[PDB]
Amino acid sequence: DQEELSALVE
Amino acid sequence: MMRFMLLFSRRGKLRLQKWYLATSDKERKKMVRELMQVVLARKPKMCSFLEWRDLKVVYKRYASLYFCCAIEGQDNELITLELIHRYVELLDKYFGSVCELDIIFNFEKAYFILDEFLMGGDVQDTSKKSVLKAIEQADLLQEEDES
Amino acid sequence: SASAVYVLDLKGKVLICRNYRGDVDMSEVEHFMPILMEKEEEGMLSPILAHGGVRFMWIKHNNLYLVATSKKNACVSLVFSFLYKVVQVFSEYFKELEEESIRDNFVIIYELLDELMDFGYPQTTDSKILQEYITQEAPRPPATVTNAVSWRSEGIKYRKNEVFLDVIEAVNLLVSANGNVLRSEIVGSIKMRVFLSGMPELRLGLNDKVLFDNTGRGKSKSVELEDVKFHQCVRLSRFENDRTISFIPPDGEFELMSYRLNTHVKPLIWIESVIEKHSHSRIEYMVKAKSQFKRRSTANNVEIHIPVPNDADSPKFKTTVGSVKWVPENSEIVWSVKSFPGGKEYLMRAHFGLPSVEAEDKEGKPPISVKFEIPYFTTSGIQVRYLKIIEKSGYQALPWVRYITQNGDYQLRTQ
Amino acid sequence: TSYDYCRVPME
Amino acid sequence: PAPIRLRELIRTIRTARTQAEEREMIQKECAAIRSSFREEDNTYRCRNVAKLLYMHMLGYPAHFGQLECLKLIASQKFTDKRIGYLGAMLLLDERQDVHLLMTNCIKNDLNHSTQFVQGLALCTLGCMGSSEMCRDLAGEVEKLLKTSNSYLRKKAALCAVHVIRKVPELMEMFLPATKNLLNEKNHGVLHTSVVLLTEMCERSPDMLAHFRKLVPQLVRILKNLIMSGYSPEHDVSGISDPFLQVRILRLLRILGRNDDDSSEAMNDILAQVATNTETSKNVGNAILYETVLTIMDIKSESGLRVLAINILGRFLLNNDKNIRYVALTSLLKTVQTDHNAVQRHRSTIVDCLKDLDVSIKRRAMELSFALVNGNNIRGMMKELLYFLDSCEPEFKADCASGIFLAAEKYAPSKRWHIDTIMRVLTTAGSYVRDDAVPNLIQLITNSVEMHAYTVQRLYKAILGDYSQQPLVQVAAWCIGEYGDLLVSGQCEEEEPIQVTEDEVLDILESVLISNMSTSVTRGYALTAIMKLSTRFTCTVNRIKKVVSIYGSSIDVELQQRAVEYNALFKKYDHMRSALLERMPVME
Amino acid sequence: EIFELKAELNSDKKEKKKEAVKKVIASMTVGKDVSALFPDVVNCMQTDNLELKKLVYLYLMNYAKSQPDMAIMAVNTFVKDCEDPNPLIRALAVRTMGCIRVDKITEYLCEPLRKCLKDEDPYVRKTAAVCVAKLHDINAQLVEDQGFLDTLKDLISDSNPMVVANAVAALSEIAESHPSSNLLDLNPQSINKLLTALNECTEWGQIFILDCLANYMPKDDREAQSICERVTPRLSHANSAVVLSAVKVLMKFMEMLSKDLDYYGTLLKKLAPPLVTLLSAEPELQYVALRNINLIVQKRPEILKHEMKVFFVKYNDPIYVKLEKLDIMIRLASQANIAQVLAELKEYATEVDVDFVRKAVRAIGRCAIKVEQSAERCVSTLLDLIQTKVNYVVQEAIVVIKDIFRKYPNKYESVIAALCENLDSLDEPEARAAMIWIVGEYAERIDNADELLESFLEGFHDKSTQVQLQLLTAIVKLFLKKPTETQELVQQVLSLATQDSDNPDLRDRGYIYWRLLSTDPVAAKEVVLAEKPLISEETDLIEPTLLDELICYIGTLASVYHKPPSAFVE
């Protein structure tokens, strides 16, 4: 999925 | 004391499991599927704490990855939330802009950091700097064996 | 019966769909995969799933699901038969029937869906006739669709008329753990390739025992067919009366008939594996394989599948003939013998290493299965005695034939 | 489809 | 050559399209791995074990790799030790009893020249250390506890905690090292040592007596933390080392459970923090959570306890579901003490039963039951019972349970008690435990004056529906015992209903035949009818027929019983009056 | 961008608008909501191009109900298409409109439907035939009003077998709504015509008219024979559904045949081979077939009496197939094959699918009930299973053995020792209770019964209720048999069952046992050890009327669930 790359924190 | 800590994806895939007590592999699996069922079934704005199986369960979802600690009744939920957050901060600094995929491909490193942050069920170092430096030096020592 | 038909992907989402009756919310299909997975864990897997008063009849082909919803006491036999028929049709329209095919042919698939079934009733399902007005490369409907001969259109012309018959027999076999045959049967298939002009009348002549006995040929060699199934083209009523296989064959390739009969012979290929297991250390397979048919005949491309432990390691093989390879992906070894002449007995030995600490879950114990193929051979002794071709123009048309015996469910239980 | 075909009588 | 690296495996497995294809990939790679393991390849053991751990997380078997981890632990390379210990923590178990090798390797690695190795052995021991391993390593732990190096000192402390947890007797052996470590300036060493002390006190009272001396010290340390400046370390959104603070406050709560002096000093600081901490973020609220817990659990100045209860009030009305949960939890902890301090919020608490959050709702329910007295019982019940009726499934069992419990403890009358009981058995029914049935019968059987009334409404209950099983159990049993009182249209508690005998037989036979009736309730009903043989006079022949035909079922119990009973009827028609009369009454 | 999509949707170029709607329904395909483009794609309906037209028709069929008011823009063109000189597009239009569930479009569909119903071409004719049922599902009143059903009934008499078949299907569906009221059955004379169409139409059509025939019932033996002789050949069709419908009408009509004439027997002989061949089909069809076969062997046991072997389960069979197969095997177990069946079950118990193994052992039990001698053999088999030391098998085996002892009380051999040797490491309360009961009932032979039972009092109150009761009865039977080192034991157990017990039922039974010790020992000897009457098991046979009703539903969901349609369809 896309969100597998999304930052945990940001 | 934290009985165990799990990291699992939104879609119920295990990313990390630290057991701070002795349990049979089979039972560990039963616990994991059960708890994961329960937590994932919850609607997004539910309470970050729940009562499961004579224990207290704290969970926070960062992006797509769920962090889930199992704490004893005499322990503080909000502080465990804080320790989880600390853990993701450690991860964030180590990998740099950490995402689930990093945990997926570096689960061993995640275990490493987790073991340099927790032990036996309790925190061993309440500094981010201390822990991160420890892991850093350990990685240097490890890289020595190769070269 | 079917209210809607869906083609789904492996995760259960709709690749393509067709709403036929409007009896069921299409959105109901969203419950298909979750229910399926639910029931599978319970060990309640079933070709028919329910979400209230909604039933899903489903089959699985490659990476696709074909699902039919119904809110009524649906005719399930018809639905499954239909689903498989859709699979066949699609398979003949597109080479490989897979997700990519669906996506990339959605148009003609919509057409085919609208033509195959109306309001839940199957309509025209013959791909070779369907291809006359549902084309990949304004037409009007072929009369064939509405003709008593609905599988062959008029106008077919070949400059060289000829017919091919493939008589293919599959031997099913099931041998007990001790080694005594529990079951054995011959399943036959007659596949034809018909290249004839016009609308010919064909008649098959077999050594059908019932036919011979009714024509005073009981002394001659026959075959007693326990059951026979015929292609649509065959005139069933005539067979019922006097065992006559009469038909106007469709154009090209088709399966004319299937038959089933018992066997009175020793199994064509006999496997005997004995196992010595030294727990926590090693396991050894000593296996002999003997071909029990005429030395004049020869079996090709024979593979002998033998299950081995899932935690086994460091394999060592020795054979008198042929090679062995470990296939861990299927937790088995495969002994391959390329050419296996009759009356021969070959040998094989395998040595595996086993973990010192035992497995957590017992894994299960599949039987030994074998695949083989013997050309110019029939265990049945069936013979296509004649193939009569009747054309108004009486052109010369010579038929051909060949006999192949191969494995069906050919498996030997293990202990 | 590699094996040989024998002819069959139109008897 | 050459065994693929971990990441490559991971990628490959993620390329799988079915669980089947994945399984095949696992089996293939694992085949390679095992065969490599046989060759005793010291080069690629590490990566293979790592790959095996990843595959073990996915649920695939990894037993064959277990004692390979040992080979990595007993290695001399650091990498091998790292992975080996990790895999030792993941794969090994107290089922293997490979205690000797683990123990010896840990011994060797604890006295290692490099601190990180010692860290591996320490973390491993502290995490999964067997009781026996703890026995044999305790000395080494103690010696390691007296190092100067912080990095190993903290782990030494927590490993000491672990060994204490696995063996209780050995805690005293750590006493000499536990003295004056508070003078430390390292927050890690501090925290860990506080954990060790907390465990210690929590184990033995004499240890409490001993360590409650350094209370003013840790009070000063805590006070320093609170009055500390911004340190770019230990600080989280404006608070320094809240883990340490919380640990200290927990230690304080245990150091002064029933003491007043300690309670006084800590009264001063608890006041300070309860007033001074910032509750804008989660951190502050956590500190205040544990603070409140401390203040309320210990014996102290009511002037502060008021303030604590106030804090909990402000929490309970907060919008953050988590906070409200915290409040309800806290209150739940301090109800067995300072009961009235909680009794101030009963309105709000019960109001939380309407909350949509399941956690909130549940805690609210638990607290609600924990608030029932002999006074509010008349009212609270109406609420709880209401809550039972409009309940979502997951709560019903617990709710019925607690209702029964409270009604057992604080029932104004027997009429009321029985009323609520019947109410629960009718509105909840299936959700009540079968094991609750006996405790109910006992209560209706120790209430003689009711009896016939209870029976009346019981029969009246089951004629409606005999689906809810415990209901028909209780019922059919009471019909059995008090059949005469049922039939005798006389009830000195409410207007009796017109009853008969054949209709009773109809309902009991209906219970016997019905698919909904379990085997045990069939038993109940059968024995009941048998009692009706003595308790009734008109139509005994019909029930003789009943027992006769029911003497042949596949049910072992039913057949045994019905056969015995048939023997009685056939031969000893006079003995039933002797043996089929009311049973003795228990507690 | 929707706006450019609209632009190309109205752009004067043919290709651009064609590709526009292609992208539109392609967007629709992947799950999008392309509803907002309703008016734009409709303007592409009036086309010379059949591909575009079909696509637009699909669009409408998908979105019209969601946009009922705008849908009227499709009406004109629609009716026009029902008069197009190409029959293909004509029927296309007809079958399309019958799917749009908007009242207006139905109104406008009425007349062109009427035309197409008597259209010259058979394709459009049968298409209309089905469209009639399509309409009837929307508004039965409307159909009655326009007198379409009469024209349908007349289309049954059509010259073209496809039109015939489709009309048969349609009308048959209509008659479901009008059960016996205004019955739409025809005479034998018509049955002949249907029987001809049967030989003259598609496989699916064959199914249709077989399903139609099935609702009829022959008036005598002569007619029944007459039509059975014309359906019987259908059992050789490759299509399994055809075969199964044939089976249906045959199983239903064979009743009216005189059982003293040979034809009945011939029919039974002729009905077995197709039923076996069904088990060689794809798994789903195997399942369906299996269910219906269960019904049949229950109704006509003579057909598949000796066809046991085909019902053995193969390793690679899906679990459902395995389960059904077990059932059939039990139902076909006779003295002639029990050794082989027991061999099979013994093998099945080796599997790892737990529920399958359980069902298999239980099946051993059922076999032991069905046949007589089997029992001994059965027990032997069971014993062997117990020696596999696999607990979940052991417990089951104990329970079924208990059942066998209960039904056939001649099993007093050395067997009763062997199981006692199993350490009694059993956990399942059912197994414990079974073992307890066994000890008690046969305590005469078990000298150490005295001891064994005693070992189960340790933790009496934590043990299950059933176990408590059975232990009570067991000890009572033991002591009552031999008042030796037993009186103190039974004293203990009675004290536990009455004085220490809070379980009302146990309290009752125990108290009666004490009231029976105290009053009379001989009375108890004649009471608790009374010769029990034989145990009467509830049959697994479905009620004959419900069975006969279920036979009429062969090949339908009813034949899978074994329930009437009224029981599961909403």
Side-chain angles (χ1 to χ4, degrees), chain F residues 197-465:
Chain F
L198 188 63
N199 268 83
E200 224 183 333
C201 71
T202 68
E203 38 181 318
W204 314 109
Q206 294 185 27
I207 300 170
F208 297 163
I209 74 187
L210 279 167
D211 288 347
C212 183
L213 268 189
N215 281 348
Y216 177 79
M217 184 68 79
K219 302 167 165 151
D220 52 48
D221 174 43
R222 207 157 200 81
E223 193 187 25
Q225 245 224 45
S226 164
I227 99 102
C228 285
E229 286 176 335
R230 286 192 297 281
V231 174
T232 308
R234 256 56 250 175
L235 297 172
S236 288
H237 200 278
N239 196 321
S240 318
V242 175
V243 168
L244 206 50
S245 292
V247 174
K248 169 154 56 63
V249 329
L250 294 189
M251 285 288 303
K252 182 177 172 191
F253 287 13
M254 61 160 47
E255 297 306 316
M256 294 292 305
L257 294 184
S258 177
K259 299 185 182 165
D260 269 86
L261 283 303
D262 319 25
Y263 182 78
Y264 174 89
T266 65
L267 186 50
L268 296 194
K269 300 295 151 49
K270 215 165 316 286
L271 211 50
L275 294 174
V276 165
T277 305
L278 294 177
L279 311 177
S280 67
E282 309 80 330
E284 302 83 13
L285 286 151
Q286 280 200 261
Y287 178 68
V288 182
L290 278 171
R291 308 295 306 152
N292 292 260
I293 281 180
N294 192 320
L295 289 181
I296 296 171
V297 309
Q298 269 182 192
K299 176 66 171 173
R300 288 302 175 201
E302 282 287 329
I303 301 182
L304 292 177
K305 184 195 290 175
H306 310 99
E307 295 301 323
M308 163 71 71
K309 282 179 188 296
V310 321
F311 296 99
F312 295 169
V313 329
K314 313 169 194 227
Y315 182 80
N316 44 345
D317 282 336
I319 193 195
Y320 45 94
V321 185
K322 292 188 167 194
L323 300 179
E324 302 306 322
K325 278 195 179 174
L326 268 184
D327 229 268
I328 307 297
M329 286 185 67
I330 285 175
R331 295 191 193 276
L332 291 183
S334 74
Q335 331 176 26
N337 54 35
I338 340 175
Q340 210 174 193
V341 173
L342 287 182
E344 282 299 284
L345 297 179
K346 168 53 195 167
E347 178 64 26
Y348 299 174
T350 317
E351 301 210 11
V352 299
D353 184 285
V354 185
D355 306 330
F356 183 58
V357 177
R358 294 204 157 111
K359 257 58 95 64
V361 183
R362 270 118 84 161
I364 294 188
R366 305 208 61 191
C367 291
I369 272 66
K370 293 276 189 167
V371 248
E372 61 292 349
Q373 185 141 59
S374 55
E376 200 171 341
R377 286 122 110 191
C378 289
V379 167
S380 181
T381 301
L382 285 169
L383 257 54
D384 296 19
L385 274 164
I386 311 182
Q387 291 186 22
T388 59
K389 312 300 183 209
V390 191
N391 45 12
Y392 85 93
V393 174
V394 167
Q395 295 155 7
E396 286 284 357
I398 287 287
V399 183
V400 43
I401 281 177
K402 173 218 67 180
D403 297 313
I404 304 185
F405 289 5
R406 278 196 66 196
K407 188 189 180 61
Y408 312 113
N410 86 92
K411 309 302 169 193
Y412 61 95
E413 304 76 13
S414 61
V415 40
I416 327 188
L419 22 81
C420 290
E421 263 178 346
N422 265 279
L423 290 14
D424 307 43
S425 56
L426 26 71
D427 306 331
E428 193 185 16
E430 293 215 25
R432 283 181 182 175
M435 195 69 262
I436 283 294
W437 177 93
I438 287 180
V439 167
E441 250 279 5
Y442 292 137
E444 301 72 283
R445 296 159 196 75
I446 354 280
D447 340 276
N448 49 356
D450 158 272
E451 193 170 22
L452 288 175
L453 296 167
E454 186 186 288
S455 165
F456 276 143
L457 299 180
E458 283 208 17
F460 179 95
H461 291 306
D462 287 332
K463 288 185 181 55
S464 39
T465 66

Side-chain angles (χ1 to χ4, degrees), chain B residues 23-25 32 41 97 100 104 116 121:
Chain B
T23 326
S24 60
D25 186 273
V32 169
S97 196
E100 187 184 348
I104 300 187
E116 209 63 90

Side-chain angles (χ1 to χ4, degrees), chain E residues 151-406:
Chain E
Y151 182 83
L152 302 172
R153 221 173 194 279
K154 49 186 184 196
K155 311 177 178 184
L158 294 189
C159 193
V161 174
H162 175 58
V163 52
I164 289 180
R165 289 203 176 104
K166 266 296 171 56
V167 285
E169 39 184 11
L170 271 58
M171 60 157 309
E172 43 194 335
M173 95 176 294
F174 301 93
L175 237 177
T178 53
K179 297 166 188 162
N180 60 270
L181 26 65
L182 283 307
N183 304 118
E184 205 63 31
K185 244 43 180 190
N186 180 276
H187 298 241
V189 184
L190 230 309
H191 184 297
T192 48
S193 47
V194 178
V195 173
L196 176 51
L197 294 177
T198 307
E199 286 300 313
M200 280 189 145
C201 305
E202 231 268 300
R203 306 297 158 158
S204 298
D206 321 44
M207 242 60 52
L208 272 145
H210 194 345
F211 291 108
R212 69 205 325 166
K213 298 179 183 160
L214 58 96
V215 172
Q217 157 123 62
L218 54 78
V219 154
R220 292 175 165 218
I221 301 181
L222 168 52
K223 190 166 66 186
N224 199 316
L225 286 171
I226 306 180
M227 291 294 298
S228 167
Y230 170 75
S231 175
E233 187 180 313
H234 326 288
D235 177 84
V236 285
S237 293
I239 292 86
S240 291
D241 227 297
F243 306 98
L244 184 45
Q245 299 195 26
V246 173
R247 266 301 166 176
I248 288 175
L249 295 166
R250 185 167 169 186
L251 183 58
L252 280 172
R253 175 189 145 259
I254 76 176
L255 285 182
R257 267 272 315 183
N258 310 70
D259 178 29
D260 295 331
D261 205 320
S262 53
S263 303
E264 197 76 31
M266 79 186 51
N267 266 7
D268 211 37
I269 43 95
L270 285 165
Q272 152 135 87
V273 53
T275 52
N276 235 16
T277 190
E278 180 189 32
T279 73
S280 70
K281 303 313 295 306
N282 182 64
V283 205
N285 294 262
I287 306 291
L288 175 60
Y289 176 15
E290 200 65 33
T291 294
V292 158
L293 288 176
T294 296
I295 295 185
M296 298 303 308
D297 184 68
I298 68 193
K299 309 186 80 175
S300 64
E301 175 195 37
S302 296
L304 184 42
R305 312 176 73 88
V306 165
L307 189 55
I309 298 297
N310 298 335
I311 286 293
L312 294 178
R314 295 135 70 187
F315 272 177
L316 222 162
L317 277 309
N318 193 290
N319 303 274
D320 191 37
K321 295 192 178 177
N322 304 289
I323 298 300
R324 301 202 295 276
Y325 174 83
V326 169
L328 262 49
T329 301
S330 309
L331 295 179
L332 228 175
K333 285 192 174 149
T334 170
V335 132
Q336 306 85 5
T337 333
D338 301 35
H339 187 278
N340 242 83
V342 178
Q343 277 287 346
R344 302 179 185 186
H345 313 263
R346 21 138 93 251
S347 61
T348 34
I349 292 178
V350 172
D351 286 10
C352 286
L353 294 180
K354 298 188 200 304
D355 201 315
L356 286 198
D357 189 283
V358 175
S359 303
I360 302 296
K361 178 175 292 187
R362 188 165 227 101
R363 238 64 206 282
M365 176 182 60
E366 300 176 357
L367 202 38
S368 301
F369 281 115
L371 244 42
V372 174
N373 310 279
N375 307 340
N376 48 331
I377 176 63
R378 293 259 179 190
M380 292 239 56
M381 185 53 57
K382 300 168 178 272
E383 223 84 62
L384 296 174
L385 211 145
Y386 162 70
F387 166 82
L388 167 65
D389 206 336
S390 69
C391 238
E392 29 200 329
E394 71 176 286
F395 293 103
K396 299 208 164 188
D398 291 325
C399 187
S401 305
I403 285 183
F404 280 119
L405 198 160

Side-chain angles (χ1 to χ4, degrees), chain C residues 83-235:
Chain C
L83 288 174
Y84 280 106
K85 178 64 65 162
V86 167
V87 170
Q88 176 197 308
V89 176
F90 287 171
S91 292
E92 288 172 11
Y93 258 80
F94 326 113
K95 291 150 196 201
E96 321 227 356
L97 174 56
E98 54 186 9
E99 182 169 338
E100 194 177 55
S101 292
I102 304 306
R103 304 176 181 281
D104 288 327
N105 291 113
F106 75 100
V107 167
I108 201 182
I109 297 180
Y110 273 139
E111 298 204 1
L112 284 173
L113 284 182
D114 180 76
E115 195 66 20
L116 281 169
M117 166 170 285
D118 193 13
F119 200 68
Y121 307 108
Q123 298 303 281
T124 313
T125 63
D126 307 278
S127 53
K128 31 190 48 173
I129 308 298
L130 241 20
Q131 276 167 347
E132 297 189 11
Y133 61 111
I134 311 293
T135 43
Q136 318 84 316
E137 189 183 31
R140 78 194 310 93
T144 310
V145 178
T146 48
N147 290 354
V149 182
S150 45
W151 49 94
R152 169 181 262 257
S153 292
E154 299 167 12
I156 302 179
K157 257 190 276 189
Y158 287 104
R159 284 147 148 176
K160 181 191 183 174
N161 316 269
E162 54 187 351
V163 172
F164 298 88
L165 292 83
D166 284 45
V167 176
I168 312 194
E169 299 192 342
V171 182
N172 300 332
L173 176 78
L174 186 43
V175 186
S176 68
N178 306 281
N180 69 285
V181 170
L182 303 181
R183 187 152 204 266
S184 190
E185 78 171 344
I186 305 194
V187 191
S189 184
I190 292 174
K191 296 196 164 56
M192 302 179 68
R193 298 167 65 85
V194 173
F195 311 114
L196 298 176
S197 314
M199 305 291 291
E201 193 93 27
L202 270 64
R203 294 214 301 272
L204 193 65
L206 312 168
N207 46 336
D208 181 14
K209 172 173 201 292
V210 175
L211 187 59
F212 278 8
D213 296 347
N214 294 16
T215 49
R217 276 176 286 180
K219 54 198 185 194
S220 53
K221 174 183 170 193
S222 67
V223 55
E224 194 178 27
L225 311 169
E226 299 299 339
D227 193 25
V228 183
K229 290 297 178 281
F230 285 107
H231 192 285
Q232 173 85 354
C233 64
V234 186
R235 299 170 195 251

Side-chain angles (χ1 to χ4, degrees), chain C residues 358-409:
Chain C
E358 286 193 1
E360 254 164 59
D361 308 309
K362 289 147 220 164
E363 206 62 58
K365 179 190 53 59
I368 294 185
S369 71
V370 14
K371 297 184 186 170
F372 62 88
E373 191 184 38
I374 314 180
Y376 329 113
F377 196 93
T378 45
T379 321
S380 156
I382 195 183
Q383 300 156 5
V384 39
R385 289 182 60 258
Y386 66 90
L387 177 68
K388 186 185 272 69
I389 305 182
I390 300 307
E391 172 64 13
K392 72 189 301 179
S393 71
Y395 52 69
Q396 186 211 9
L398 23 62
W400 303 87
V401 73
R402 64 183 181 176
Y403 301 90
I404 312 176
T405 307
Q406 66 189 17
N407 61 274
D409 291 284

Side-chain angles (χ1 to χ4, degrees), chain B residues 92-109:
Chain B
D92 183 79
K93 189 72 159 76
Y94 181 88
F95 292 107
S97 196
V98 70
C99 67
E100 187 184 348
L101 201 51
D102 293 328
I103 286 91
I104 300 187
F105 276 96
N106 314 268
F107 80 98
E108 20 95 30
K109 317 196 198 308

Side-chain angles (χ1 to χ4, degrees), chain F residues 38-61:
Chain F
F38 202 116
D40 301 275
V41 329
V42 156
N43 291 279
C44 305
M45 191 178 330
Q46 192 178 7
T47 318
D48 321 316
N49 189 24
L50 176 56
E51 184 182 359
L52 187 64
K53 165 150 301 190
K54 270 163 164 288
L55 268 47
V56 180
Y57 274 12
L58 173 74
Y59 181 91
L60 292 177
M61 267 197 294

